[PDB]
Amino acid sequence: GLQRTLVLIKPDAFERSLVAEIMGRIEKKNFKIVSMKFWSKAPRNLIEQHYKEHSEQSYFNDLCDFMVSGPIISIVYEGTDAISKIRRLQGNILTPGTIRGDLANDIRENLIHASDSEDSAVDEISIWFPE
Amino acid sequence: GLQRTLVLIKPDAFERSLVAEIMGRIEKKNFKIVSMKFWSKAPRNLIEQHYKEHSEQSYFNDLCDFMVSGPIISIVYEGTDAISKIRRLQGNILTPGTIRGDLANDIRENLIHASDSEDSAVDEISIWFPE
Amino acid sequence: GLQRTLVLIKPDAFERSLVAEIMGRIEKKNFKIVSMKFWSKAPRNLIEQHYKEHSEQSYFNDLCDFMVSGPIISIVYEGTDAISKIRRLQGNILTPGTIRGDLANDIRENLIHASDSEDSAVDEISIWFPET
Amino acid sequence: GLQRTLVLIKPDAFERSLVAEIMGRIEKKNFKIVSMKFWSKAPRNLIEQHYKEHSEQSYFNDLCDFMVSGPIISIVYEGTDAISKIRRLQGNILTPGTIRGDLANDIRENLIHASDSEDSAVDEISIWFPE
Amino acid sequence: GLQRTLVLIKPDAFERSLVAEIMGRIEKKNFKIVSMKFWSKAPRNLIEQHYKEHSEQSYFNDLCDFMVSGPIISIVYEGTDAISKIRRLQGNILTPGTIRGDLANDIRENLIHASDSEDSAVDEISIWFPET
Amino acid sequence: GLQRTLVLIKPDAFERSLVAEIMGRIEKKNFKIVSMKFWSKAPRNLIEQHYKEHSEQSYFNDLCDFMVSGPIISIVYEGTDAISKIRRLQGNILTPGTIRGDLANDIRENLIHASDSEDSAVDEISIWFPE
Numbered sequence: 001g002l003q004r005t006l007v008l009i010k011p012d013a014f015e016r017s018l019v020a021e022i023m024g025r026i027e028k029k030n031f032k033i034v035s036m037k038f039w040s041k042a043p044r045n046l047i048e049q050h051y052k053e054h055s056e057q058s059y060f061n062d063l064c065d066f067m068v069s070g071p072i073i074s075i076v077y078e079g080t081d082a083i084s085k086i087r088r089l090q091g092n093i094l095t096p097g098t099i100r101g102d103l104a105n106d107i108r109e110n111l112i113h114a115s116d117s118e119d120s121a122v123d124e125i126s127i128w129f130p131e
Numbered sequence: 132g133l134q135r136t137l138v139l140i141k142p143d144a145f146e147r148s149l150v151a152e153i154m155g156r157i158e159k160k161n162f163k164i165v166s167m168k169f170w171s172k173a174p175r176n177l178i179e180q181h182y183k184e185h186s187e188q189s190y191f192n193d194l195c196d197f198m199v200s201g202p203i204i205s206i207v208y209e210g211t212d213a214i215s216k217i218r219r220l221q222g223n224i225l226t227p228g229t230i231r232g233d234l235a236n237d238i239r240e241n242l243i244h245a246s247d248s249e250d251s252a253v254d255e256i257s258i259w260f261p262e
Numbered sequence: 263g264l265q266r267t268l269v270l271i272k273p274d275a276f277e278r279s280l281v282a283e284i285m286g287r288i289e290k291k292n293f294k295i296v297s298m299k300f301w302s303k304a305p306r307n308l309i310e311q312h313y314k315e316h317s318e319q320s321y322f323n324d325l326c327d328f329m330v331s332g333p334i335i336s337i338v339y340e341g342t343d344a345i346s347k348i349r350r351l352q353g354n355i356l357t358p359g360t361i362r363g364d365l366a367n368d369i370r371e372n373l374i375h376a377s378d379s380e381d382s383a384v385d386e387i388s389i390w391f392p393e394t
Numbered sequence: 395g396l397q398r399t400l401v402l403i404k405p406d407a408f409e410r411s412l413v414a415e416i417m418g419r420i421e422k423k424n425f426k427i428v429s430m431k432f433w434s435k436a437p438r439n440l441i442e443q444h445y446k447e448h449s450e451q452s453y454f455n456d457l458c459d460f461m462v463s464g465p466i467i468s469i470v471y472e473g474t475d476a477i478s479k480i481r482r483l484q485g486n487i488l489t490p491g492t493i494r495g496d497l498a499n500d501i502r503e504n505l506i507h508a509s510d511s512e513d514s515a516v517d518e519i520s521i522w523f524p525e
Numbered sequence: 526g527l528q529r530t531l532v533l534i535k536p537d538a539f540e541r542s543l544v545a546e547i548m549g550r551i552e553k554k555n556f557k558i559v560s561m562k563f564w565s566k567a568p569r570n571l572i573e574q575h576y577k578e579h580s581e582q583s584y585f586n587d588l589c590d591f592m593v594s595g596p597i598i599s600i601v602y603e604g605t606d607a608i609s610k611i612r613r614l615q616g617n618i619l620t621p622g623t624i625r626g627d628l629a630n631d632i633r634e635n636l637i638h639a640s641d642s643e644d645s646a647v648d649e650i651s652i653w654f655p656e657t
Numbered sequence: 658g659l660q661r662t663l664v665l666i667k668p669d670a671f672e673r674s675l676v677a678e679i680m681g682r683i684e685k686k687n688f689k690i691v692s693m694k695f696w697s698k699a700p701r702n703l704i705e706q707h708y709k710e711h712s713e714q715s716y717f718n719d720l721c722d723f724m725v726s727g728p729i730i731s732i733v734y735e736g737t738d739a740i741s742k743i744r745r746l747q748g749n750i751l752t753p754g755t756i757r758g759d760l761a762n763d764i765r766e767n768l769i770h771a772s773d774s775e776d777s778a779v780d781e782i783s784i785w786f787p788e
């Protein structure tokens with residue numbers, strides 16, 4: 001069961017003071033922080049790498065600008081079935097009960113990123129936590 | 132995709148002291164109050180207008196009775212995709228995660244009303260905020 | 263209209279201090295407590311009865327050992343459609359918004375039991391509150 | 395400094411649906427339930443015993459009336475310095491931050507009782523949990 | 526027994542999305558809303574009246590500009606000893622447990638106004654709800 | 658007005674899953690995270706330095722053992738009057754309304770450290786954040 005997954009707390013969370021609300025939802029589901037970094041302004045290369053699959057999309061530049069417009073936190077979380085469960089926890093802006101469902105309402109500004117597969121998770125954990 | 136929708140806080144919300152809890156869920160999802168009005172008792176006229184589409188139903192008079200049995204608040208909310216999102220937030224007594232899902236347990240006394248279409252929004256806003 | 267259903271708060275709720283959290287979710291949905299008992303350690307035959315339909319499963323022994331590993335609370339809740347609505351409230355660990363969806367992440371240690379039918383309700387009520 | 399104290403959840407807690415809110419504050423401060431008992435209506439005998447020290451006061455019968463006007467829960471709690479700490483938690487309708495401070499507004503209907511001394515704890519526990 | 530008092534939710538509560546949080550604190554203490562108005566922008570003379578006793582202070586102009594910088598809500602609350610108890614609820618930024626103690630950290634932007642006496646209550650109620 | 662102060666999230670917070678609850682209380686008072694580190698097990702020299710003034714007290718060894726018995730988070734917080742306000746926010750295990758007042762009940766295991774003066778704050782910020 002045991003996996004690790006990468007979470008990003010996005011800048012809209014810092015602006016709207018939802019940082020703890022978000023982290024708290026994950027904690028209460030019993031996932032453990034295994035490593036964590038605070039970035040006051042994330043190095044733009046890091047964000048470009050992080051959203052590489054998106055480099056061709058029309059939202060890519062606006063996206064990068066946003067991800068660098070305020071602080072972010074990068075967290076590695078550990079627990080049973082972590083990648084899938086934290087993804088569900090993240091949710092979408094349509095359906096309530098989730099982080100995005102309760103607290104967000106934008107296609108770009110949605111508070112949180114969570115890895116969506118075992119592969120994107122190893123990759124993302126290496127970008128943000130090379131060590 | 133900026134919209135405006137009409138929300139009623141129903142008399143059972145006041146009876147059960149859930150007014151802030153309900154307004155808070157809508158506030159947390161980033162919707163903004165544009166107009167608001169407290170009615171210690173609503174004119175049955177306005178209630179019957181608001182529920183005109185239901186005028187030929189069994190529950191029609193019970194519902195009107197309840198709607199005037201105590202205070203209500205009429206709020207116009209605004210934000211991206213307001214009508215549909217606030218409708219999901221309202222949800223139903225069957226789905227936990229929503230206002231009715233977490234807090235209500237009845238076909239009639241269900242805490243809240245939210246416009247369900249662009250047309251009923253424009254119409255209901257006009258009922259409650261004729262000015 | 264009105265039904266009664268049986269809830270068990272499991273020992274992981276005590277270990278994790280979530281007792282109030284769970285009871286509150288049911289309280290905020292307007293369900294009323296009609297009976298309630300705190301068992302610092304529930305007698306094993308009560309537990310085995312409660313889970314009797316499960317007696318031939320691979321997990322049966324482990325489940326009972328767990329349910330006896332800490333305190334539990336048994337509660338009869340009353341309200342409209344109590345049985346099915348508290349079932350929905352409990353939910354499962356895959357479904358955000360529910361008790362298990364927000365707070366549990368295990369196949370066995372999942373915080374709460376709730377009757378799933380009218381018969382299991384009637385039966386489980388009698389097991390934990392035989393005085394009727 | 396392990397102690398045991400007796401807490402009553404009063405009938406106004408049930409009326410106002412604050413039972414979990416109250417138990418939750420005591421749970422969050424790390425106190426553990428040692429015994430608990432639900433009374434749909436308490437025998438006036440037990441109430442009069444519990445409040446024996448008040449038997450000659452103006453409010454004595456009103457208080458007994460209220461105490462039997464609806465359910466109550468009697469709980470024995472345990473943890474370091476339980477009697478005094480749970481008393482502070484209970485607080486009063488004047489000081490926000492406590493159970494009565496945040497939630498109650500009356501001299502009689504004040505949600506909760508907590509033992510105030512080592513002696514009244516031993517005595518009250520014996521009233522409610524004679525076994 | 527019963528009193529009524531005037532509460533203002535200040536524009537920093539809208540900016541910070543704390544409107545429900547603040548109103549909830551007052552609601553959970555069993556105070557009832559008896560009147561309420563949302564002002565997307567309160568007329569300046571209403572604000573100046575409301576703070577008229579403050580007209581000669583160094584902060585007077587800045588305060589009024591602030592109070593007009595966003596929406597505000599005016600509310601009459603009713604309950605036992607409403608005036609003094611909601612004052613206590615509001616508290617100050619030095620006192621944890623109160624609205625300002627937990628959520629505010631500024632001399633001017635402090636979320637909430639509440640009447641401090643029976644006379645200021647009666648007067649402030651008339652300013653924001655002149656229809657009586 | 659503007660100061661910075663050092664906060665430690667102690668291991669009892671990780672054990673009891675109060676990490677977000679604690680950080681959230683500080684966030685809602687409007688203080689900003691300015692830097693932050695997650696330590697799965699803090700280097701014992703760091704903790705010895707951190708509690709130097711205490712090196713002669715009888716609790717010093719038990720204290721160090723505890724501070725290294727689980728994870729801790731070190732945070733630098735910024736805001737008006739930060740050192741004094743976060744100290745009040747931290748509080749003590751007696752009086753409710755605070756982090757310690759609501760959530761703690763031990764002389765050693767009390768969830769959080771907060772610097773108590775402009776001097777201890779520069780010092781502590783340098784131990785945990787040499788850069």
Ligand SMILES: O=c1ccn([C@@H]2O[C@H](COP(=O)(O)OP(=O)(O)O)[C@@H](O)[C@H]2O)c(=O)[nH]1
Nearest residue numbers: 054059062063107108109110112113114116
């Ligand atoms: O049209 C879009 C879609 C995506 N995004 C942003 O870029 C990320 C794109 O990844 P994806 O569409 O897969 O969203 P996710 O999987 O994280 O839900 C999202 O988190 C958004 O914040 C955006 O700005 N515009």
Ligand SMILES: O=c1ccn([C@@H]2O[C@H](COP(=O)(O)OP(=O)(O)O)[C@@H](O)[C@H]2O)c(=O)[nH]1
Nearest residue numbers: 185190193194238239240241243244245247
């Ligand atoms: O059988 C019913 C159905 C409706 N209602 C009330 O009338 C409103 C309109 O009914 P509808 O099915 O449209 O509920 P909605 O989900 O739209 O609010 C509901 O909110 C209820 O408060 C009722 O009393 N009995």
Ligand SMILES: O=c1ccn([C@@H]2O[C@H](COP(=O)(O)OP(=O)(O)O)[C@@H](O)[C@H]2O)c(=O)[nH]1
Nearest residue numbers: 316321324325369370371372374375376378
């Ligand atoms: O593989 C399993 C499945 C069940 N359980 C436990 O025993 C109960 C089994 O009943 P069921 O699968 O029907 O779960 P529930 O009805 O409570 O949702 C669960 O709640 C778990 O606590 C278990 O230990 N192992």
Ligand SMILES: O=c1ccn([C@@H]2O[C@H](COP(=O)(O)OP(=O)(O)O)[C@@H](O)[C@H]2O)c(=O)[nH]1
Nearest residue numbers: 448453456457501502503504506507508510
């Ligand atoms: O004037 C009063 C004082 C007391 N009480 C009730 O009787 C209890 C005991 O009074 P006391 O002053 O000891 O209150 P305590 O703070 O100890 O609970 C209180 O909790 C109230 O519920 C009352 O009805 N009227």
Ligand SMILES: O=c1ccn([C@@H]2O[C@H](COP(=O)(O)OP(=O)(O)O)[C@@H](O)[C@H]2O)c(=O)[nH]1
Nearest residue numbers: 579584587588632633634635637638639641
């Ligand atoms: O130096 C000051 C003091 C007051 N205020 C503002 O104006 C009100 C002043 O009234 P008072 O000092 O009596 O505060 P309150 O009675 O609301 O506690 C405060 O709430 C602040 O919003 C200000 O802007 N500067």
Ligand SMILES: O=c1ccn([C@@H]2O[C@H](COP(=O)(O)OP(=O)(O)O)[C@@H](O)[C@H]2O)c(=O)[nH]1
Nearest residue numbers: 711716719720764765766767769770771773
């Ligand atoms: O008798 C004691 C007193 C202190 N402590 C621990 O060591 C720290 C000592 O610092 P101080 O007594 O000044 O506590 P604080 O100022 O942080 O409240 C406390 O946080 C406790 O966690 C302890 O273990 N035993």
Ligand SMILES: [Mg+2]
Nearest residue numbers: 114115116120
């Ligand atoms: Mg994706």
Ligand SMILES: [Mg+2]
Nearest residue numbers: 245246247248
């Ligand atoms: Mg409809």
Ligand SMILES: [Mg+2]
Nearest residue numbers: 376377378382
């Ligand atoms: Mg089953």
Ligand SMILES: [Mg+2]
Nearest residue numbers: 508509510511
């Ligand atoms: Mg007393």
Ligand SMILES: [Mg+2]
Nearest residue numbers: 639640641645
């Ligand atoms: Mg004043």
Ligand SMILES: [Mg+2]
Nearest residue numbers: 771772773777
């Ligand atoms: Mg100190």
